[PDB]
Design a protein around this ligand. Structure first.
Ligand SMILES: [Zn+2]
Ligand SMILES: [Zn+2]
Length: 188
């Protein structure tokens, strides 16, 4: 089996996620028409659990509502049906900041909380192509998760107090390898 090389702030194990080296570049290429119009796009990181590690095998672009600051999924039935038919786990998500810097926004933090509650290893990849930067983030666990779970603040740009999120350990939590990737587009 693959061994544990990363632990949460609460001392709980994080299984390795193997990320295809091509994924970030290919994602940017797929969503480039939106990026050029200053519109965010997201993709879902999908894959399999094998010998105590996760492997991202599919990049799935879901039905979603593009704006300059958000890219929430709309009708998830097709996403759920695709993952069901292909026996794929949700391992995280990737999205663009077409013109801004690389960080997790207020909405990104609320979005990611549900991913990371479902799977402690879940990751949020953020691409900032106009800056040529990217990052892979997670919430602090338990503290950051607690903060977002409890948050009832109004406004979609509202700030949060304290240390809420961090970059993931690489290669301890996420490791990049030369693996295959299927790109699936569920949009019209
Ligand atoms: Zn964002
Ligand atoms: Zn909040």
């Amino acid at each position: 089996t693959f061994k544990i090389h990363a632990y949460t702030e609460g001392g709980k194990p994080l299984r390795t996620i193997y990320l295809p080296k091509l994924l970030k570049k290919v994602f940017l290429d797929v969503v480039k028409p939106n990026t050029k119009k200053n519109l965010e796009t997201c993709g879902i990181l999908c894959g399999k659990l094998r010998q105590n590690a996760f492997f991202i095998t599919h990049l799935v672009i879901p039905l979603q509502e593009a704006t300059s600051d958000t890219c929430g999924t709309t009708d998830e039935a097709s996403l759920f049906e695709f993952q069901d038919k292909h026996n794929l786990l949700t391992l995280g998500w990737i999205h663009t900041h077409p013109t801004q810097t690389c960080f997790m926004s207020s909405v990104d933090l609320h979005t990611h909380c549900s991913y990371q509650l479902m799977l402690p290893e879940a990751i949020a990849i953020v691409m900032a192509p106009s800056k040529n930067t990217s990052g892979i983030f997670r919430l602090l666990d338990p503290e950051g998760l607690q903060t977002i779970v409890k948050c009832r603040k109004p406004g979609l740009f509202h700030p949060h107090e304290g240390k809420v999120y961090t970059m993931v350990a690489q290669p301890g939590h996420v490791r990049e390898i030369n693996s295959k990737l299927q790109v699936v587009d569920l949009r019209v």
